[PDB]
Design a protein around this ligand. Structure first.
Ligand code: TW3
Ligand code: TW3
Ligand code: TW3
Lengths: 514, 138, 514, 514
């Protein structure tokens, strides 16, 4: 029986409120800026290289993606902002590579396409990082990989950062071999010149498609498994190969009919705003994203700062954990309990981080908070269910670790355009450094002047402010993308769908330090 | 007489809708009935998808750029003119009928795609538009 | 029956030869320089901080290690050169942390000790990398971890490189939790101040030892499992805890009595020298290191450039693969065959890299060499037996990948003081860049002058020369240490011994592209 | 998405061509002869024994099969030609036993029925071989076995070939016991006299049905589990028992709607003909049999002599490997690659053998061809996916091994009425023997005359010609039947359907000698 009613979250916000108006203005401005920057990145390497690429008869990489995926299928691009102002004078749109998840012949696949326009498709260090992240995603979620190889090899002026180390270029080939061993299909499509150091990708792959115009490779080397007249033919052949994969999706979770949330998503703009100093109820966000705005809270009156419960997204079950204030002992214990419960029942986990800075409270007895957050950290680390993190606000200190940051391998991690990430708030770091130097130079009997205090403080403030920018964090691959809040639900759906390809296996826990 | 712009718009909409119907048929069999990937939305992160299509009218080849709007309507630009088109296929009796609005003008016809030719039968007449063969095969 | 005789490798070198004299002089100079630098690093943070540390009553970290390990046991330190001239003006001896493998209570354990003298034990990015490498080694080889925590938290002026990313600070805790889940003992000894962000390490650990002089932690928090009067008492308690671990070493390989090699090891100095242009027979090295100088070569007349065979080191079986010239198709096929064979019989693998540069030969038809080296790369990547790499000469290009570089996760990787590592030789890179620019500016009709050719060439030459230095590569953690050749055998023994703690599991291979 | 079009094989043959006319005439004559011989075998032991059998009130074995299987279900009979002119003066139709696969109560079952008319149902050696082959098929494909026991025991005048050895009579009981242990149902129906040495079959079986008219067996011995009035009642009881088996078919491969091939099958008669000297494109056959004539070739321009690709038969996926000329190194490597690929994706394999004789080329450097065919042989042997072989032309030498001959345990093996199988061509063997004797008697100084050359040559030619006949090979159980080409598709369907009953398990490969 599934007929009894359930209470729904969410309340209608006050559209007339001045606070709502101001928050809406600020967040809409941020989203417009994000959209403009994304368009500029989408334009690619430049009109020069684009005209040259077209004159050679080859398709532009975005056109390749459009023709490859199923007609009208949504495409989930990752890390559109890699390399954004990362290097001092060189502009590297999209990191020189395009990675995403899309449905080909009814199968979710991870597509990795080199962009020939950007520096002839050379490999900047950020490009290697992006590709490794994509391969890691595909390995974890058991997704076939399709490479659209139009490469130029390592960027020589930066070889020291691309070639030698463990997470450097060679790891790419390593991943390929491993994913072939675990029976995850590898398809390579040599749509560009087969330059030095590039033939390794087709040779490692399970199956190859090579566009006609090395010649020795198809006729004598035999590296070629298929031989295509041009780009369109190659993409069609790729679709045929994917069909011939003999794969069927196995899902192991209960499914229910999906239902839209009761409240419009754009209202989030008013609720969240751009000021981190003001706070908001995470329950509003949860009401905006989950199915039917139906939510079953767990331990509502204990550890009120954390909000944990069960819901459904597009019919899949999810356990939601979010911050609603300063994390405490009770909140940590509640989180550990909830994580154990979700792991036992094999339910995917969704974290929402809105870590609150310690500027409000001087001490907060970091020892006890640490003693309890350690338990939550261990529980999150040992979990095996799919985990997806979303940073809707500040993310500072060990709380970031506790709420499944990058170090804890969430299947995906996205940030809203108003997030901030750093070890601490800038002013707190300034005070810490000032106190350290003051105490030390007092210990040696040296005098500490207030001018020196300002001299230490100001650079730290500016540096922390600059490094906390979402664009700074997404230029490096610290997140899989910056998403417009109004689309959040949709993205999560796609992500969770992909995460369901892999089977869910049992969770083993370490010693629970009681 | 040579086919107008709007007839080409209707034909392109019909072909897109048939692709959507095929996607639905594949979805019905699969385990993941409610996955968002099965939607024919064409959504992208922070970008709007534009699909370049080529349709053959008589001897002439005409290129249509179809932008997949968020609302589900399609913005098709052919040459210098952009047309807002929203439509759906429903079955009248045993025949598939396309009802579609182009720039707010509603038209009703019956649509049959056999081989590479799209036939729109309406009270005004019959319009035949030919999908070019990829010609890499056949 | 084990009585039949076996032929032994190695020949007596010509001590009177001028070439031998010169090579001996150069290599001895290199080793003396290495020893002097190691002594200076061993001195630690400085006399100032050392006196301050002693005045507080605490022991110096090296003394801690000496008292902790079993009396007279050899201690295998790793990455003594991390941070060597890595940062512009800051001297960070040993990376601020000391990691090694040593025998405690008859059990091989991985010991990680913070150095309080260096910047109060703050965590530079290189320190995080070193610690993560040590934890990875312990996880792979299934070794108990002992932490001697005297920490100061992240180095704030560099927070952006220490806190946020996947391989940044949080991964430490992640590793701890995981290694606790797989039943690998975690012991933490809080020998210093329990500052902010430090209590997480004791809280994550399985067992704790805390030196008396937080107070709340032992009496009320209950984080303390043991409470020690001072450093000596804490180390004794640690030995007792390790004994109480209830662990017994399980070995799954045949063992034979060990026998010393027939030739003195110091002769290597004469054989190898410091000039990479001259070449030498790897069989000399193999004769110098393996037991009794007994070696059973495999496919001796096919692919002569690669040398593959079986031997014993301290009684353990090893399969040895080394370069003796330019790698070719036949060499790659021989290597793949040998790797498959060793994986089938569960034998550890030892690689010796002496990759030869392509300055000698203009083309070397990189396509075929690539087509075959891909097979060897796949075979090496998919292998599951313990792999140890040693770089005795040049290491360039995809050959480094083929001979199990860092990207392919060897259990250990060491380099001799005369190695060179880079994507290509410097002059080759200069020629490549010059040709690219010349061809391009010819394409646009621009004129290319010889002055511009020199202007491009010289910086590249100097940069590649600088980046290839062993000290440059070991300053970053690209290798687990620079070893005197005269000690090589010994080191390998210890390493292999440690690698035997983990059970050897079956190897799964991808599609062998025939 | 499954909407994109695929190119189809096959071309319309020239019906007006004289070559087509002649080939059609010859092949139609062969098929008519085959049909006539099959009818004569179907007539059974003879009118004498048939009248005697009817007078006793028992049904004829073919009537038993007709009533047993589901109404209108197709029945796949195996080895209809066993014993055809095998013994000098004794005519043994069908080997004295009838074995086939048919659907009973919706379950594929292997039916084995003794023919009482032929020598009172005695067991000739060929009968034992046929029964063992049937039991092997059922064991491999996990099919319930139904025995219709009307036996007479071993044929005493030939006891030395029936009783003592491993593949002699006792192995029957062995198989029964084993198939009972692995939970494969054994049903025995004693429809004839329970003579000496026959009661073992009911006693070994899981369930019994005994026709009333030993009496002691049902009332006191208790061997009887069911007791039937006559044959019709016994068959009905058998159907009820099969229903009570509690079995459900588990399929683990993707399924698609089936579609008929685009070209008529009878055209094969014109394409293939009866002359092995002429050659034809195997792609014609593939177009005639696979679904929709859709085929996705793999490595089309490398090793053109072998044709490998993917297709669907009745909706199941199959990998097709066929000969189109003299096998070479590249062909062998392509075959090995394809076999690995199919094993990885768990796809059934279908081999088509048209091995070409070496009369065209004197040497063909057998050493290299051997060195490469060894790899293909190893790959085929180690494979675990269902394998079905079809011999459409010549089959000679080690090529037969390479294309999965009987020694390599294909699930089924059929031959067309125009095949030839032998170690070599007759003339080649004659030349080899002549050269051996000539060289030897030259070595001893004896003279070799041309008359002696003819004397050696002619008997060998005649003997090889006689032994290569399809009827000769099918008289012994070297194949599971001779099939009319026009029906080939259908047969394969049934066969593959049966092969899907067993689960497909992973393939383990030996050392790939690179
Ligand atoms: C794995 C291991 C172990 C090792 C290796 O892999 S070692 C690989 C060595 N690489 C090559 O051997 C490829 C050399 N390229 C070429 O052969 C071509 O160039 C292509 C193939 C790139 C197509 O490019 P193209 O020819 O179609 O156009 P182009 O404009 O010429 O393309 C942009 C131009 O590339 C210049 N450029 C600068 N640095 C590099 C760089 N590192 N790689 C490539 N190009 C670079 C750029 O400065 C200029 O543009 P700019 O700066 O003047 O505006
Ligand atoms: C996990 C997460 C998520 C977050 C975090 O973890 S956020 C952690 C914040 N850290 C602290 O809160 C510890 C603050 N230290 C102290 O409280 C003490 O200092 C000790 C404990 C370090 C003992 O050291 P000590 O007091 O015995 O000696 P001291 O000489 O003072 O030691 C050297 C001096 O440290 C200065 N120094 C500069 N930068 C740092 C730095 N980043 N950390 C520590 N010290 C630093 C150095 O400049 C000077 O020496 P110098 O450069 O003048 O020669
Ligand atoms: C397991 C182990 C470990 C050991 C054993 O199992 S040791 C088993 C010993 N067998 C018996 O103990 C059965 C002896 N048969 C009989 O008791 C009956 O015969 C029946 C039962 C067979 C019914 O047959 P039936 O009586 O209804 O008709 P019949 O015409 O008589 O049937 C044909 C005639 O059988 C003659 N014939 C020749 N050789 C044999 C033979 N080997 N077995 C049977 N019959 C044979 C044939 O020559 C003649 O016909 P033909 O050649 O003259 O035309």
């Amino acid at each position: 029986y599934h007929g009894d009613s359930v209470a729904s979250l969410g309340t209608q916000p006050d559209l007339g409120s001045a606070l709502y108006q101001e928050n809406y203005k600020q967040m809409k401005a941020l989203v417009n800026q994000l959209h403009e920057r994304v368009e500029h990145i989408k334009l690619g390497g430049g009109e020069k290289a684009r005209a040259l690429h077209i004159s050679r008869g080859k398709l532009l990489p975005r056109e390749r993606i459009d023709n490859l995926i199923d007609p009208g299928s949504p495409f989930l691009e990752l890390s559109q902002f890699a390399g954004y102002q990362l290097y001092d004078n060189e502009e590297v749109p999209g990191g020189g590579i395009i990675t995403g998840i899309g449905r080909v012949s009814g199968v979710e696949c991870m597509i990795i396409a080199n962009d020939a326009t950007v520096k002839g498709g050379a490999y900047y260090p950020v490009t290697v990082k992006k590709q490794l992240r994509a391969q890691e995603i595909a390995m974890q979620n058991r997704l076939p990989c399709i490479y659209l190889v139009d490469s130029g090899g390592a960027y020589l002026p930066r070889q020291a950062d691309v070639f030698p180390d463990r997470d450097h270029f060679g790891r790419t080939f390593y991943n390929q071999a491993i994913m072939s061993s675990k029976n995850i299909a590898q398809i390579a499509v040599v749509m560009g010149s087969c330059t030095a150091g590039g033939a390794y990708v087709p040779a490692m792959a399970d199956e190859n498609i090579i566009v006609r115009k090395a010649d020795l490779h198809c006729r004598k080397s035999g590296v070629s498994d298929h031989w295509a007249l041009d780009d369109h033919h190659a993409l069609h052949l790729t679709r045929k190969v994917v069909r011939n994969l003999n794969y069927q999706k196995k899902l192991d979770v209960t499914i229910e009919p999906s239902e839209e949330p009761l409240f419009p998503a754009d209202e989030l703009y008013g609720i969240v705003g751009a000021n981190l100093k003001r706070s908001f109820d995470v329950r509003e966000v949860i009401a905006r994203i989950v199915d039917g705005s139906r939510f079953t809270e767990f331990k509502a009156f204990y550890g009120d700062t954390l909000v944990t419960g069960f819901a459904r997204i597009f019919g899949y079950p999810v356990g939601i954990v979010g911050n609603n204030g300063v994390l405490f002992s009770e909140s940590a214990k509640k989180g550990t309990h909830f994580v154990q419960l979700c792991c036992q029942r094999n339910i995917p986990l969704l974290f929402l981080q809105n870590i609150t800075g310690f500027m409000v409270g001087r001490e907060y007895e970091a020892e006890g908070i640490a003693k309890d957050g350690a338990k939550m950290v261990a529980a999150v680390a040992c979990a095996q269910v799919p985990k997806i993190t979303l940073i809707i606000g500040g993310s500072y200190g060990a709380g970031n670790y506790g709420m499944c940051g990058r170090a804890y391998s969430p299947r995906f991690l996205y940030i809203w355009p108003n997030a901030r990430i750093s070890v601490m708030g800038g002013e707190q770091a300034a005070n810490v450094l000032a106190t350290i130097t003051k105490d030390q130079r007092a210990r040696e009997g040296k005098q500490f002047s207030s001018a020196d205090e300002a001299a230490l403080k100001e650079p730290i403030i500016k540096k922390f402010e600059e490094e906390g920018n979402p664009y700074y964090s997404s230029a490096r691959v610290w997140d899989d993308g910056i998403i417009d809040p109004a689309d959040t639900r949709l993205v999560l759906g796609l992500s969770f769908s992909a995460a369901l390809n892999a089977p869910i296996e049992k969770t083993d826990f370490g010693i629970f330090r009681m | 007489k040579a086919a107008a712009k709007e007839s080409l718009c209707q034909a392109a909409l019909g072909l897109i809708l048939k692709e959507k119907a095929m996607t639905d048929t594949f979805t019905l069999q699969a385990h993941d009935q409610f996955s968002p990937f099965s939607s024919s939305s064409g959504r992208r992160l922070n970008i709007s998808y534009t699909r370049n299509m080529t349709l053959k009218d008589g001897k002439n080849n005409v290129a249509i750029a179809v932008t997949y709007n968020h609302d589900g309507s399609y913005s098709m630009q052919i040459e210098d003119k952009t047309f807002q088109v929203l439509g759906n296929l429903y079955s009248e009796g045993d025949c598939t009928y396309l009802k579609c609005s182009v720039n707010g003008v509603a038209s009703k016809a019956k649509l049959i795609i056999l081989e590479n030719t799209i036939y729109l039968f309406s009270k005004e007449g019959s319009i035949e538009i030919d999908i070019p063969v990829p010609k890499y095969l056949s």
